[PDB]
Structures are given as structure tokens and as C-alpha cells.
From a paper:
In addition to transcripts encoding an FP clearly homologous to A. victoria green fluorescent protein (avGFP), as we expected, the A. cf. australis transcriptome also contains several transcripts encoding other, much more divergent avGFP homologs. Characterization of the recombinant proteins revealed that these avGFP homologs include a green-emitting FP that appears to be the brightest FP discovered to date, 2 long-wavelength-absorbing CPs, and a reversibly photochromic FP. We have identified several new Aequorea FPs with the potential to further diversify the landscape of fluorescent probes and biosensors.
AausFP2 has a distinctive cyan-blue pigmented appearance when expressed in E. coli, with a broad absorbance spectrum peaking at 610 nm. Every Aequorea CP displays a broad absorbance spectrum that lacks the well-defined sharp peak and short-wavelength shoulder typical of most FPs and CPs, suggesting that these proteins contain an unusual chromophore and/or chromophore environment. X-ray crystallography analysis of AausFP2 revealed a conserved dimer interface geometry containing many conserved residues between AausFP1 and AausFP2. We suspect that despite AausFP2’s behavior in gel filtration experiments, the native oligomeric state of AausFP2 may be a dimer. The amino acid residues making up the dimer interface in the AausFP2 crystal structure are also largely conserved across the other Aequorea CPs, suggesting that if this is the native oligomeric state of AausFP2, then they are all likely to be dimers. The X-ray crystal structure of AausFP2 further revealed a chemically novel chromophore in which the side chain of a neighboring cysteine is covalently linked to the methylene bridge of a twisted GFP-like chromophore. This amino acid, Cys62, is conserved in all Aequorea CPs. The C62S mutant of AausFP2 appears yellow and has a major absorbance peak characteristic of a GFP-type chromophore, strongly suggesting that this conserved cysteine is necessary for formation of the red-shifted chromophore. Quantum mechanical calculations indicate that both the presence of a sulfur atom and a twisted chromophore are required to produce long-wavelength absorbance. Because of its broad absorbance reaching into the far-red and near-infrared regions of the spectrum, its relatively high extinction coefficient, and its efficient folding at 37°C, AausFP2 or its derivatives could ultimately prove very useful as photoacoustic tomography probes for deep tissue imaging.
Numbering used by the authors:
A (entry chain A), B (entry chain A): 7 to 64, 68 to 232
């Protein structure tokens, strides 16, 4: 299903320190090259927080997997998987995020419930002081202890506009939505790249995201 | 000072859940290739915990740095730097670690105070149920907020013998020991590899470690 560009559609309902907002993204992902491009629009007016804080919540199924690592994400399709994260910001609040990642009508949908609490008034998140202009991130992927799904961990070192860097710590799980046979990997990493940009022509609150995604047998490739 | 193999000497005084032990390592590191080899011996009898839990505490100065990233570690030599870590194990205790990394008499010394508390009796650390046979780790390196030193973060996904994987979360700082001019980088990563082995000939409690260390401009290389 993932040999070639396919539509990538995102629906995020957000609730951060009791500020409710909706985001819709349309673009494309290519699971054989590990590339995607998508434009996110806030449909309820303006995001009450850093766009950058939304980006990883808004499709690791598009990751370019080598043939020697089990690709859990593609193995669950078309029914797909649940992707859940706790994201903890150094000196700031916490996001609780639940995603349904499914293949429907020839398209990959990321449907996201994005909740945040404890965020600080003069913090980088509510202050919108974060930047992902061009940034590499390494994500740890492995089988959960029961061998029914995935767990993972990673940091993002967000650029802080007029500051230094802000670490957000992510804990993730992925569990299949269906009862079909799934493929469980051992420990590996994703080398991921984000570039975020704004259309100066566009008048609505939005952000354009390009990602690169590659699964890496770091146990071999780091030697 | 780091163009070619030079002696690498480690002295670790350890205190884990009130169990005191000493480790001495001798080997070599090569800062131009980013390789090192060292054999660690417990001099007080036996390590009262997983060797694997000691390995990253027991010389990022040996990291192969490209010319487009500031190499803080080599910029501090010969006086060298302090390297401090809090290491937190999922469902287990915490290590507090202070290192002095100095160049003395043509050799690179890592002098380590390794403290651990809250470790669980039937846990993977005191139970010695961890393995680093062949494992890749990605370390985040960046300038601290004051621009006087480094901060960093990383996970190690330890193999658990007869289990799955155990995440240890590391927070690190590096601060110069001297008053000399130091070179402060922006965010990048190290792709590091560990291979641990035992000499079946050797009769003392020991472990042999080979590391690969490369500094990576992930903001470019992950695209």
C-alpha cells in the first residue's frame, strides 16, 4: 500500500491548558522513500501554542524500512495502529496524545486527540518561542515487553527563538487496531528530519512540514 | 593531542546502594578515527551490579568530530572538563556520576565518582541481567543556556538477558576544568557503538569494551 506517494490527511482536536482548537492537514507520504509533505491549517482560528509542539503528534508508517528490520507500522495496515505519547517539556507542561493511524479510501489518516496541561504562562510553548526550521531527531523503536506492540523514547531539542534549546522528552507506544498478524521488531532507531515553513501568501494560521524518515539498524550502522 | 592512538586510563570509585567497589581500565582512544578499546578490571573483587550500567560512565573527547561542528571536548584539553550525569532507569534506581576528563603525561584519564541509590533487589541492575554485546546509542550534544559549557540527553536501550529492553535516561553536563578559551557547539548528535566481551582466559571480574564515536550534523545528515 506504501510503494509510492499516497494522500496523507491529519485531523487534530487539541485542548491545551483548556484552550480548544482544531487542525486539518493535507499532503502526501511515500513509505518507499520515507518522505512526506503536508500543510497544517488551524480551522478554529489560531493555535494557542507553538506549532512546533504539534508537529510529531501530526505517521511513522511512512518511514523507509530496510528489509532486515520488522516494519510494525506497515504490518498493521490497512486497519492500522494506536500511537500514544506522553511528552514532557523541561521546566514546562506535559502533552497526553492519542492517535489513530489508519489506511482508508486509498489514504493514510492520522486522527489525533492532543491534550496538554501544566504549561507555564511565560514558557516557550504558550509563548510560541520554538522553531523547527531544519532539525534532525533520533527516535528509539522496539518491541514492548509482551511482544504485542511497540514502545519508544526520544528527545526533541527544539530551537528556542532568542534562547538556546528546549528538550521535550517523549515516551511512545504503538498497538495494532485490528486482530491481524503484526510484525514486532527488536531495538532500532529512526533518523528523522523536519523542515517547517510558512506560506507568506497564505492568510490562515498554518505551517508547512517536510519530514524525512529512515529506520536504522544502529547496532550495525553506528560501528 | 588526539591525532592518533593515545593511552586511555580509567579510575572509577563506585558506591551503589552502599556497595563500594573500584574499577581500573587501560586501553587506547583515537580522536581522529573516533575508536577506543579498553579492558576494565574490578580491583576490589566483583562489581556488585551490571557491568553494562558502568560503561558510559567509564571519554567523548575521542569522538570523531567533523570540521563544521565545534568540538567542545578537544577544545578543553589538556586541562580538560567535568562530565556529570543523572542516569534514571525505568522501574529502577538512579546513578549520580561525576567525571574528571584530563590529558596528563601523554594520556587521557577518565576519573569517575559513580554513586547509585534506590536500586531494586530483583531489578536488572543489581540482578546483572543487562547486555551490551553490540548496541548503537544516539547522544544529543548542545551548548548550555549560558554558553560556558555543554548539556546533553540520551537513552540507552539495554538488552535484558531473558527479558526485552530496559531504558536508562541520561541527563549530562560538561564544564571546562580550566580558564582557557573553549569552543561551544549548537545542537548535534553522536552516533556511538558499544561492543562488550569477556576474556575467558582472564580470571578477575572484568569487561572489554570497544566504542565507535562520531559527531553528526543530524540537522543536515537526517534530510
Amino acid at each position: 500500500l506504501f510503494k509510492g506517494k499516497i494522500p496523507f490527511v491529519v485531523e487534530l482536536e487539541g485542548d491545551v491548558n483548556g484552550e480548544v482548537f482544531s487542525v486539518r492537514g493535507n499532503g502526501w507520504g511515500d513509505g518507499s522513500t520515507g518522505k512526506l509533505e503536508i500543510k497544517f491549517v488551524c480551522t478554529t482560528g489560531e493555535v494557542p501554542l507553538a506549532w512546533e509542539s504539534l508537529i510529531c503528534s501530526m505517521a511513522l508508517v511512512f518511514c523507509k524500512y530496510p528489509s532486515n528490520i520488522n516494519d510494525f507500522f506497515k504490518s498493521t495496515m490497512p486497519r492500522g495502529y494506536i500511537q500514544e505519547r506522553k511528552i514532557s517539556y523541561e521546566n514546562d507542561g506535559t502533552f497526553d496524545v492519542r492517535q489513530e493511524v489508519t489506511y482508508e479510501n486509498g489514504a493514510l489518516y492520522n486522527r489525533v486527540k492532543f491534550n496538554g496541561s501544566g504549561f507555564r504562562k511565560d514558557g516557550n510553548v504558550l509563548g510560541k518561542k520554538l522553531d523547527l526550521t531544519s532539525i534532525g531527531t533520533c527516535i528509539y523503536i522496539m518491541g514492548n515487553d509482551e511482544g504485542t506492540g511497540l514502545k519508544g523514547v526520544f528527545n526533541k531539542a527544539f530551537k528556542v527563538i532568542g534562547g538556546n534549546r528546549q528538550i521535550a522528552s517523549h515516551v511512545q507506544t504503538q498497538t495494532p487496531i485490528g486482530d491481524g498478524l503484526v510484525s514486532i521488531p527488536d531495538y532500532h532507531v529512526m533518523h528523522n528530519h523536519i523542515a517547517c515553513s510558512k506560506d507568506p501568501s497564505e492568510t490562515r494560521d498554518h505551517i508547512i512540514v517536510k519530514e524525512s524518515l529512515r529506520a536504522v539498524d544502529c547496532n550495525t550502522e553506528y560501528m
